[PDB]
Design a protein around this ligand. Sequence first.
Ligand SMILES: Nc1ncnc2c1ncn2[C@@H]1O[C@H](COP(=O)(O)OP(=O)(O)O)[C@@H](O)[C@H]1O
Ligand SMILES: Nc1ncnc2c1ncn2[C@@H]1O[C@H](COP(=O)(O)OP(=O)(O)O)[C@@H](O)[C@H]1O
Ligand SMILES: [Mg+2]
Ligand SMILES: [Mg+2]
Lengths: 759, 749
Amino acid sequence: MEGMLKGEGPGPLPPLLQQYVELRDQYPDYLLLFQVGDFYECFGEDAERLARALGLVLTHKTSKDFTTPMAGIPLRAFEAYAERLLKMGFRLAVADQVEPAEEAEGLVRREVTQLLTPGTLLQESLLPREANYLAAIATGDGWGLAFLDVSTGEFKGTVLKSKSALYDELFRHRPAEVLLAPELLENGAFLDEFRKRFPVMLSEAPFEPEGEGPLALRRARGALLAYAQRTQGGALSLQPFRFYDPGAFMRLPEATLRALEVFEPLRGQDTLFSVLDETRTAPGRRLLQSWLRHPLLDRGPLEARLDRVEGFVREGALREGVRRLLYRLADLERLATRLELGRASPKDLGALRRSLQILPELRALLGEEVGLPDLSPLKEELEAALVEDPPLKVSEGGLIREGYDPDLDALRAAHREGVAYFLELEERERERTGIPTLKVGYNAVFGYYLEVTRPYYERVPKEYRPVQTLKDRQRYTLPEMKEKEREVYRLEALIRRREEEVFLEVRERAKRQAEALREAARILAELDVYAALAEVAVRYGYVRPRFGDRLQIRAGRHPVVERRTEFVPNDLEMAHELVLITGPNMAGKSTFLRQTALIALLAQVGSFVPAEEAHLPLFDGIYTRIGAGKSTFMVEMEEVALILKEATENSLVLLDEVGRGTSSLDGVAIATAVAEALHERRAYTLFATHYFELTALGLPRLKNLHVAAREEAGGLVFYHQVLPGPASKSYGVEVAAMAGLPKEVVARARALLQAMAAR
Amino acid sequence: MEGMLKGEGPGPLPPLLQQYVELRDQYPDYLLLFQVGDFYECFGEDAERLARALGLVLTHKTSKDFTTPMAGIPLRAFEAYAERLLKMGFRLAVADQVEPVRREVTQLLTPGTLLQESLLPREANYLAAIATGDGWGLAFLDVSTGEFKGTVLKSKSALYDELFRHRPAEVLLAPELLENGAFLDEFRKRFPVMLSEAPFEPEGEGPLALRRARGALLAYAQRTQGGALSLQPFRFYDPGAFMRLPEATLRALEVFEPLRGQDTLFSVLDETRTAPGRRLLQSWLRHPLLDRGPLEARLDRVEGFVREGALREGVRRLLYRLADLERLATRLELGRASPKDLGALRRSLQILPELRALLGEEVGLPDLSPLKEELEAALVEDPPLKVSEGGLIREGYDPDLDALRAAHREGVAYFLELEERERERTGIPTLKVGYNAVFGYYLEVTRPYYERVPKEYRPVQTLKDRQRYTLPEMKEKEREVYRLEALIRRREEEVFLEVRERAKRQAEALREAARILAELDVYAALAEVAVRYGYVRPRFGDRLQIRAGRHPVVERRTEFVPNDLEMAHELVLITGPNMAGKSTFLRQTALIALLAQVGSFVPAEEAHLPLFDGIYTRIGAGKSTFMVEMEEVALILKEATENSLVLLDEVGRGTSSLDGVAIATAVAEALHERRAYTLFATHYFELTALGLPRLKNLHVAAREEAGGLVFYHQVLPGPASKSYGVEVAAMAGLPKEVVARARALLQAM
DNA sequence: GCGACGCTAGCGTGCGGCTCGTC
DNA sequence: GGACGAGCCGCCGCTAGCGTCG
Ligand SMILES: Nc1ncnc2c1ncn2[C@@H]1O[C@H](COP(=O)(O)OP(=O)(O)O)[C@@H](O)[C@H]1O
Ligand SMILES: Nc1ncnc2c1ncn2[C@@H]1O[C@H](COP(=O)(O)OP(=O)(O)O)[C@@H](O)[C@H]1O
Ligand SMILES: [Mg+2]
Ligand SMILES: [Mg+2]
């Protein structure tokens, strides 16, 4: 069994290392960072792991019995080192010195304070402005999926019917760590797939049901709570759990977010989110992100969002003011959570004090209608307790302002006089001794001292007690000092105790406003998004969309592509119609399709869009078969299947070249059947194809569009006007030629084309 | 800004920072790493970068009149941060404190001029330079090996190819190229690699563009290896004297790098035991042979080891981990060999005698026993390049050093007697005798014994729990131990240098040895591979006949189905359902031809192959895919000859079905008239019936087992007659109605 | 016939703070 | 001869090695 360390030598394991091993084997998959004084240490193989991983120095901690390896890092840089460690895939186990040193039974009590897992981080410097989720998956009456953001207390979940739905929901939440129920873990089949589709870190957790609701949900939830409660090291700060239904929002499968690069790019470029987000606060960015993850289906609320955006679009003054003020607004939502968790540092409070000072200016600028909570009381006491620049930890320098604590002002009082003492003494001795240069100094090793140079050694009085000798200086001590020096240490010792109590007192003060802090967070976050979305409209020429059943876009453009090129706007009118798009490659087909979806996606999120006039219907979902079964034809077909099994007459469907990847024959066949299917379905379907046949089909709601090329001076020039009607001819041979194909080879091709044309 | 440091305050740069800025300003395009004690430091704006790029602790360097930000890395950790910093596109200038307030630029770390082993791969590491004149000038240099070669290319297309065969680490474009905005905009896009500036004043003879490129390399590399370079005679070569292997083919075939999803022809194939070997073999794969004479000679050598298993196994054992004599030689020649190097060298020399026993005089290895006896006589059984430079020469090697070390030791003894003797008079069995730079030697007494501390003493320094004293009869014996510790350094370094020099006088013998072993290593390894995976010796002749050939890389991962092929300047179409094996087949055919013309055995039973002049592929995936594919095709049509192996994989796709078949037919014809060995996997059954005299059909098929379709991987003769598109959409999950509708449509046509 | 305490010099990650030599 | 390198001690805690309770 386990209970031994890697150290060479016989005899027993020292009292400390003993305590080290005792905790180290309770968290087998965590790198244990042992708190020994002002350093975090690791011994044995664990010490080696560290040294190399962090380039630290490898040393040893020798004892009578044996000698083991040692590696440590100064607490000062804990987080600094933590971050690096986490990014490599380690779970950290922080074992701290619980009870103080001065009052310990020899060996100071040490226990694991917190656990640092990628999906349960609370450390602000270790978190992105974005939401950080822990996700739990379980079975038992369908698929159970739950998320928890330990830093904000967001706690939500649902139950999905298919393995497909689960993966979609999971992929739109971008979980940073996943807990898999017993069943799924065992099943090597599933695990492979999951591990392959979501390269996220996996972790073990007990899936004992918790609360009420579908068995599956209760298990995932419990798993979350079980795990998080363990890494936090105490009760968690949870928000009302949301058992939500993804059927209430617009469907955005994984293939759509990916193909549309809503959150992640295909080529280290921009994404819809990067381009759209100009929020100033972190909760703001989170809100916006949340909105994109689940676009609304309901006209009313979307119109509500659009009014508030339009508001700031008009009030440029106001809009720039609110944004000018939010630049300084801290993550209240997270701060409120750190407080409730009794983790708030003086850094946090200083931050809180600044944010709260912005409130009243926002109140004035927008009016008392914003609903902002009145924290003026809290804000003030903070300004009256904290230094203009709050230090990191309490025991060190001044944290509380002078004049705030009667008990503490008397302490700095006594300390000031006490220090002055030694100053007075200097002059008294420089006289009695007649030694002009006589200094009075201090230092950790010997305490307060009287210093005298060599030229005056024979001039030093009997009374002086030697304490330290240097190259050409000697240091003495009088009895008076010895006393007054301990009066100073007592003070200093009392000054810390109190300064920290006052801090803790004031903190708890802010902790009773946590909920108020939370609601200001929400209000100010919406404020942030509304102004940001407006900022984006103004800067990039977007307009307010109008909803209805007919889609009529005028001068629409791709929101991301136009960011890096003179983009030629285009129009579109659809209505449960089947719109085929033909024309030469490099002309614009694929970009046109993508442009259409993004516009729809932006509108149904409440943002203005990249067009001159945009009348949009409320799509129940955006489905795509763009870009991307051993074969390609099979992979593309599997997608058409999915798209075909969920599209409704209220779905925006975008097909790009469906039918490619096989025989010309099965090509047209499949494409035709498919195009007929989506036609019957009655969804809004944009199909970019190379089978001119599909354009001639005998369908009642079939419309035709095309892009074109003009064979000019230097070959072929592709314009991007998406003109009405079908494409006339294909430009393959022409392109081949342009590509450099030997002139005879091309001419032979033209002859073959014209021969087959002759029937 | 020269003399300017990013900081706050008026007053001049203190003495130190003044020095720093003086060097910093000498190597502008580089990040200057300044030595300060046990760290490499950066100041001002540079410190901010270093801190940024490595995420370090920004702090400040303060003097009365100026404070500037600083950040640094431990002198030790150096080579580890250098790597991160290099990979990030950083060029490094190292400034070391000349072994005892004085600093200078020792090295210049650069992607394509690296000399430090821990920063180099087993493979060659080139610095390339491209210039212009009548045709392109390409020249490669590998400062760690001395390899110096070049050629003159006619087409920018051929340029890129040679540039890619070599995978340079750093490129130097002449000024005409750097100013040509279109080229540079293209070069970066197609060749993501660090581009450096460098003078191009011609050097030597031959074409103007070559001499110029050659000069850039020489001039630039010397700046790096601060002085004369160690280089073997410049080798001018002709890409036309070897089998052509263009970037398209190298990538398509994954000779050196995978399309992601590991395993290259090279990894599978590579089984060498030394770096020179790995380099040799890579060199061969890089330029396959045309001439049967040499090829048959290589195959002869390979067979030698396939027969002599005892020999093969005995040689691969001895070579295990054997050092890189070629690089070692170069470091010695450059005057950069570390004591650790000399130690590695002696180990290598010790093994050399054994290899000669096994092989024999035939081989021609040099007898270096004398150098090996020397190295065994002077070096400790573990030289330490890092540990000072002391504890380097062993006892009894050099009398002078020996006498000094002995005297020193006595001193230490004295300061061990003063200890035993004193506490044996003061009753303080605690009393210590330690030393410190500040005052030299001393006596150390703990707090308790101050009452038992005599007056013959003289305190010099007091500590928390103890105080250190002095004595009269102790100064001399200090000013002596030191005068020696110094001399021991002075002398030991002399001997080390003397010894290092003897090793350096055997540079050629080392290079000659390295080279021979490299061949032996390669032949013996190509033998090992043939014996393990069952490769056969190929035969050369105007007809291609392969009996049961397998894709060499693919098979190491699954049960492979071998196949046959009989070509002869014919157009061989391959139809059949996707997922059956068309693309793999073309590729195995190509890899086999490659292994053969490299002098390796091949993955088959019988392989009679023609000596192709080049293998041109068109396989796999602002510009439409179609246009890119056509450009590749145009390349082949302008290159392929009747002795070329051309592999067309579904050419024609990416456009209309008409233009598709039309283009595809015109190409198939052009290659037919060309008379090259063409394997054309297509979906256009039209090609299958062109009826050309040298056209031929082959296809793969699929059965309808259990649920849907199972693809057998057998390449049968003649064309396929079906397409399983609809059959596949069915398995894909397409709604039965849509599937049925498709079938109705299919037939209806 | 030896378990149990007490006193206390000393080491050691990374790194302020203190000292000292040179001018 | 006030200021600038250049380098050693010790932090906070635990231990081992010594005396000693009796
Ligand atoms: N409306 C447009 N305005 C400006 N550039 C466009 C437009 N549509 C396409 N492009 C350009 O054409 C290139 C892409 O071809 P694309 O139109 O997507 O493919 P195709 O027409 O082959 O489906 C894009 O990278 C972009 O630079
Ligand atoms: N000779 C073979 N033996 C075993 N598997 C093979 C063989 N040739 C091909 N395959 C299989 O086919 C896959 C590749 O199909 P591929 O060669 O690309 O066929 P195609 O181009 O007709 O789609 C391989 O990864 C493997 O699964
Ligand atoms: Mg396209
Ligand atoms: Mg294929």
